[PDB]
Amino acid sequence: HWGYGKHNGPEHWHKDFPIAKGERQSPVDIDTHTAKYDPSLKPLSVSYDQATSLRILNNGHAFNVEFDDSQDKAVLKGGPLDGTYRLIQFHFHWGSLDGQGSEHTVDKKKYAAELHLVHWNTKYGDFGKAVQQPDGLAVLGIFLKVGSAKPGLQKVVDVLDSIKTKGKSADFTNFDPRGLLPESLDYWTYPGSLTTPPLLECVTWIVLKEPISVSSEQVLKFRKLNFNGEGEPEELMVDNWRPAQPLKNRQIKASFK
Numbered sequence: 117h118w119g120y121g122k123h124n125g126p127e128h129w130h131k132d133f134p135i136a137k138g139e140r141q142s143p144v145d146i147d148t149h150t151a152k153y154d155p156s157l158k159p160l161s162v163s164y165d166q167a168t169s170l171r172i173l174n175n176g177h178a179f180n181v182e183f184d185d186s187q188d189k190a191v192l193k194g195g196p197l198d199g200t201y202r203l204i205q206f207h208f209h210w211g212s213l214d215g216q217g218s219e220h221t222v223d224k225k226k227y228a229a230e231l232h233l234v235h236w237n238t239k240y241g242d243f244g245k246a247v248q249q250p251d252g253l254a255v256l257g258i259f260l261k262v263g264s265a266k267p268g269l270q271k272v273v274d275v276l277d278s279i280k281t282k283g284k285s286a287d288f289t290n291f292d293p294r295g296l297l298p299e300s301l302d303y304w305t306y307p308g309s310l311t312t313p314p315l316l317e318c319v320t321w322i323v324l325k326e327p328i329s330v331s332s333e334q335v336l337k338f339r340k341l342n343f344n345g346e347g348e349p350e351e352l353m354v355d356n357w358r359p360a361q362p363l364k365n366r367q368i369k370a371s372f373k
């Protein structure tokens with residue numbers, strides 16, 4: 117039932133998932149001036165050399181590219197984290213227009229899209245158990261701006277036509293997520309939540325300072341996807357982002373400057 121429309125959008129989610137109004141919801145506006153620099157933060161460690169992509173799915177909310185997380189093959193560590201977190205999937209949120217689409221904002225600025233590389237703490241054994249823990253997930257958020265193409269994204273954009281409607285999936289092997297990373301790993305970090313129901317407060321958010329550039333044609337193809345299932349009426353998959361939520365009693369830390 118939840119979705120991104122007038123009748124089932126972010127403003128309605130609290131009725132099914134009361135934690136929507138909780139103490140550590142995501143996303144948030146990142147006020148770059150009042151984020152606290154912390155020289156004790158470690159560089160982020162992104163080890164994606166052995167990543168095994170498997171499949172791409174349209175789940176009716178976004179598309180997920182999933183990875184084999186049954187061994188430590190693509191891991192996030194270091195940065196603000198004490199655990200090791202295995203990459204399970206990445207997905208994006210995007211807008212109907214280049215002027216919006218990101219979930220996190222930076223000094224109130226919206227980006228055309230936001231990538232989320234979702235990782236779970238190896239100490240909880242699997243994704244389902246990790247989401248039930250305040251330190252279960254580490255999500256690496258990367259902003260997309262529209263400009264030059266990101267060559268490393270194109271293999272993704274080119275399969276979208278095969279997963280147009282809700283429920284479709286396609287084989288998606290040998291995709292290297294290192295081709296989606298900006299040059300710098302400088303980051304902001306804060307404790308927060310999934311940005312979709314069930315909105316569980318289990319995420320350490322690591323949002324990179326440097327956006328990647330993608331072309332207008334690349335983002336255009338995201339917007340040709342559908343929220344509906346095949347042979348139901350066409351509802352374009354656009355604006356699948358949750359707006360910024362109150363920061364409440366949290367401090368955003370910066371690894372830099």
Ligand SMILES: CC(C)(C)c1cc(=O)[nH]c(SCC(=O)c2ccc(Cl)c(S(N)(=O)=O)c2)n1
Pocket residue numbers: 175177178180207232234253255309310311312313314319
């Ligand atoms: C998250 C889970 C429970 C697998 C799920 C359930 C659901 O009903 N709909 C969706 S769609 C969004 C999504 O798959 C997902 C998974 C993990 C994370 Cl951390 C995030 S986010 N948007 O916080 O990064 C989204 N996902």
Ligand code: NA
Pocket residue numbers: 263331332333
């Ligand atoms: Na262009």
Ligand SMILES: [Zn+2]
Pocket residue numbers: 207208209232311
């Ligand atoms: Zn997300």
